[PDB]
């Protein structure tokens, strides 16, 4: 997942959304991988801060 492309979106409390730009999906990736699922395992995502 290091330097892997990811797609994604932000969902806001007003149930509405805006897509993440790749610049953004990349930062969350660098700070969220490790929690990502891989083959033969399941992982628990935690709160992002």
């Amino acid at each position: 997942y290091k330097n892997a492309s990811m797609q994604g979106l932000y969902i806001f409390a007003d149930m509405a959304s805006k897509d993440m730009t790749p610049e953004q999906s990349n930062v969350y990736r660098d700070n969220s991988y490790q929690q990502f699922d891989t083959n033969n395992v399941r992982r628990v995502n935690n709160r992002y801060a």
Binding site: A13, D14, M15, A16
Partner: protein, 49 residues
């Protein structure tokens, strides 16, 4: 009746229903309060600072 004009109806009640349907936060959002209504009659808007 003079140069004064009062709006007598609203044209977006359906949107308000659609928004309440998805949660309190969308109905009480700032955006909700910006659903626009058409100008009442011949005229224009202007900003006075």
């Amino acid at each position: 009746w003079q140069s004064y004009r009062t709006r007598l109806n609203t044209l977006f009640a359906r949107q308000l229903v659609a928004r309440a349907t998805t949660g309190i936060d969308t109905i009480l959002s700032m955006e909700t309060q910006n659903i626009q209504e058409p100008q009442l009659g011949k005229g224009f808007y202007a900003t006075f600072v």
